[PDB]
């Protein structure tokens, strides 16, 4: 895909993706008397809530001992509104040689609730975790399709109705709601702890192995994790090969992939505007065909 | 400031910065240099990028402002396009603000003062202020161009998508009043960056840089509306600019009209969070 096309169009052997930073917050590294730190700053009223959700997500991931993520250090209220979030600084480059290792770790992470001393038998989370700026409901639910329809898709489409009053999105959603159970093939879904935002921009590596960060975690269907990884690219094929060697694709994976990508398109419509209307409606129509 | 707050909360004497999306894309080190690649998967990505290339080319041809050099527009398998350009190591505009003010004023004076005068408002191709394509059809009269191909275009989209009664009624009243803000003044076409908000300007060790243009020949004052309305420019930017192009009479009222355009564009891009500023600005203009 992209990287091969660029090597050809620009006629280069090497191509190494690199690189205040961030889509939601302003992030900067500082050296301090006790070593380096990384600080995210967000001036919006809800910033503390956002960062507390990130802290809870980082803590949940660190507790598994299966992946490396930055240690959360402090959330600081700012005079004039908003908050700063200080965490451990990690020297990092984009994910490349460590992709297959990350695929193993992400599969082990999803499997931990099933295989480990872990007993979470509902979907959701113990606290609010933000989809970028947007707070998510993580109310525990026994049924994954219910949790995903109500607390992910319907939540996003209610915000689209409030902000864009989009007739087509409303009418397509009413039809898709009816279809959703058929996409699950009568499978028994088991809760899996998710990073929650595993875009290629949120993963990286150093000389020890891969690193992931910026989580928005909850107990969900393991497959949901991969949708954003696939739709914006940037992961080597060997990441998915390693992952699916441990967690094979269940029947209907390809159709659920559209459903989970739909959620991310809706979230990008809400965060970033009407540019994301066409893929949102287009994915709904593809699911309804 | 926030840095003193961090020193206090982390209990550290030192705090030395180091290490130096939004549906853009990514940067890549490349054999022949660093490059920056913008990706857009939508069907109209190529037209969008060709407008950005045309704008960058028009600005580069003045030699007055530093912009990234366009390299290639690539059709992407499965729709959309990538736009590859020279990579620039950049930081927030700060020390170079007054220099950029000077350069932007020279840019706006370039057309009037040069050899090959463009005598109409508009542009030779479509350019996008963000994602929405604009009409750049040449017009002799700036208030005509702006009312028709900027304000009316945005309000037609708002009527189409939102059927907003208040916007429709306020525009009915405002349209006739526009020429009052321009009477008794000479308006010369000026080449504009077209989207000069603080997030589209920066600097390095050599000087300021501007990027993501949506260019057209317009009233010079239009440039500054989005710079002012969202902040982020040092005062010295404007001081330097207005030493060369002083605020003409009626500047503050035209400023509201130009900011109105940007509020409407944001309503069309991002939805009804921008409805209140749009209608309020129209009411201010009617008071
Ligand atoms: N703990 C860290 N140490 C060093 N660099 C980091 C760290 N966390 C993030 N970064 C850098 O900051 C960028 C943005 O971080 P991210 O958590 O994705 O911010 P946002 O939520 O605002 O997008 C990352 O691509 C990475 O380059
Ligand atoms: N030529 C470049 N070299 C290096 N970084 C760039 C270049 N162009 C843009 N960037 C970075 O990408 C960010 C967004 O660029 P921009 O052209 O505004 O994209 P968009 O149209 O998606 O907003 C900038 O704020 C800057 O940090
Ligand atoms: O920002 C994120 C990823 N998108 C940024 C815009 O270019 C496409 C990838 C993630 O942190 C998340 O899915 C959400 O966008 C946060 O708002
Ligand atoms: O994105 C832009 C600037 N706005 C981003 C949201 O915070 C206020 C400034 C520009 O590219 C353009 O003026 C238009 O918004 C379409 O993108
Ligand atoms: Mg920009």
Residue numbers in the entry:
A (entry chain B): 0 to 18, 21 to 290
B (entry chain A): 0 to 19, 24 to 290
Passage from the reporting paper:
To understand how FN3K binds glycated substrates, we determined crystal structures of HsFN3K∆ in complex with ADP and a small molecule glycated substrate mimic, DMF. The protein fold is almost identical to the apo-HsFN3K∆ structure and exhibits unambiguous electron density for ADP and DMF in the nucleotide- and substrate-binding sites, respectively. A The crystal structure of HsFN3K in complex with ADP and the substrate DMF. Both protomers in the asymmetric unit contain ADP-DMF, while only protomer-1 shows a coordinated Mg2+ ion (green sphere). Several bulky amino acids (Pro71, Met88, His90, Met93, Phe39, and Tyr214) form a narrow pocket where the adenine base fits, stacked between the side chains of Phe39 and Met93. The two phosphates coordinate the Mg2+ ion in the catalytic site and are recognized by the highly conserved Lys41 residue. The positioning of Lys41 and the presence of a Mg2+ ion in the active site in HsFN3K support the placement of the nucleotide in a catalytically competent geometry, with both α and β phosphates directly coordinating the Mg2+ ion in an octahedral geometry along with Asp234 and Asn222 and two water molecules. His288 interacts directly with the morpholino group nitrogen via a H-bond. Asp217 establishes H-bonds with the sugar moiety with both O3’ and O4’ atoms.
Glycation, a non-enzymatic post-translational modification occurring on proteins, can be actively reversed via site-specific phosphorylation of the fructose-lysine moiety by FN3K kinase, to impact the cellular function of the target protein. Further characterization indicated that FN3K is responsible for protein deglycation by phosphorylating protein-associated fructosamines. Here, we determined a series of crystal structures of HsFN3K in the apo-state, and in complex with different nucleotide analogs together with a sugar substrate mimic to reveal the features important for its kinase activity and substrate recognition.
